[PDB]
């Protein structure tokens, strides 16, 4: 409430708006079940509807909610494995470690990540450490808050060439109807955008980005409005003349169907435009 979002997730409601509701080119298959403890299962496919490619994956995932941990196992279709432990609030409320390990049989290759966070009133620490081989590598971030206001840094430090390679700031206000986040990366990358829930039903967003020295601006306008509680329709447009279109319909308790197109102006429907499909089940 009072503590601060993390780096990554400034500017996210802005982003959701664009993001969710929509899967151009695809056709995805998902399974999920849940439980506030103990096991849960995510499973996934994709067909990719321009390659013919089908991507499969699944995640299995045990919380020991008594001692905050979440013990979670990751593999997919390119034979990436993958495990994951994570403690919450443990020694410290709230405090967060996690470990993470990656194999690939698929080249012998080998990942391992320590991420680390802190957390409170106004403040929002942390720092992640990547043991790649060519690596390590450290990404450290902060976020302060004041009264609705909200200052971040996220650093990235490479060992092996000894430097670093990414500095980004952000600042920005945010109340629960309303969001303003900037930032930008590099002393190069400049982007805004706002976000206001406008009502119950209605969301909007507007995205700003453009880069120095370049005199060309890019801009988004999305929304999403939530029909009603089984149908959610989302439309957004960019300076590019690209059209979002996004339909969701919970077709039966636990399967919500999402149909959805993507539209090139002034060529609709004239040259070739991408639709998708998806389909979720809850258990």
């Given at each position: 409430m009072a503590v601060p979002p993390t780096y990554a997730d400034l500017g996210k409601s802005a982003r959701d708006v664009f993001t969710k509701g929509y899967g151009f080119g695809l056709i995805k298959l998902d399974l999920k079940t849940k439980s506030e403890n103990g096991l849960e299962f995510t499973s996934s496919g994709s067909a990719n509807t321009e390659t013919t490619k089908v991507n499969g994956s699944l995640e299995t995932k045990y919380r020991w909610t008594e001692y905050g941990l979440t013990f979670t196992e990751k593999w997919n279709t390119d034979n990436t494995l993958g495990?994951?432990?994570?403690?919450?609030?443990?020694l410290a409320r709230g405090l967060k470690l996690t470990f993470d390990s990656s194999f690939s049989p698929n080249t012998g290759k080998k990942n391992a990540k320590?991420?680390?966070?802190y957390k409170r009133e106004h403040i929002n620490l942390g720092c992640d450490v990547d043991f790649d081989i060519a690596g390590p590598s450290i990404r450290g971030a902060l976020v302060l808050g004041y009264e609705g206001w909200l200052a971040g840094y996220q650093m990235n430090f490479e060992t092996s060439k000894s430097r670093v390679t990414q500095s980004n700031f952000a600042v920005g206000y945010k109340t629960d109807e309303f969001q303003?986040?900037?930032?930008?990366?590099?002393?190069?990358?400049?982007?805004g955008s706002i976000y206001q829930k406008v009502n119950k039903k209605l969301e909007t967003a507007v995205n700003l980005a453009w880069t120095a020295?370049?005199?060309?601006?890019?801009?988004?306008?999305?929304?999403?409005?939530?029909?009603?509680?089984?149908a959610c329709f989302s439309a957004k447009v960019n300076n590019s003349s690209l059209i979002g279109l996004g339909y969701t319909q919970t077709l039966k308790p636990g399967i919500k169907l999402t149909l959805s197109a993507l539209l090139d102006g002034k060529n609709v429907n004239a040259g070739g435009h991408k639709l998708g499909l998806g389909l979720e089940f809850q258990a």
């Open positions: 495990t994951e432990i994570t403690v919450e609030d443990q320590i991420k680390t966070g303003l986040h900037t930032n930008v990366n590099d002393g190069t990358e400049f982007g020295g370049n005199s060309n601006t890019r801009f988004g306008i999305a929304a999403k409005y939530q029909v009603d509680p089984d």
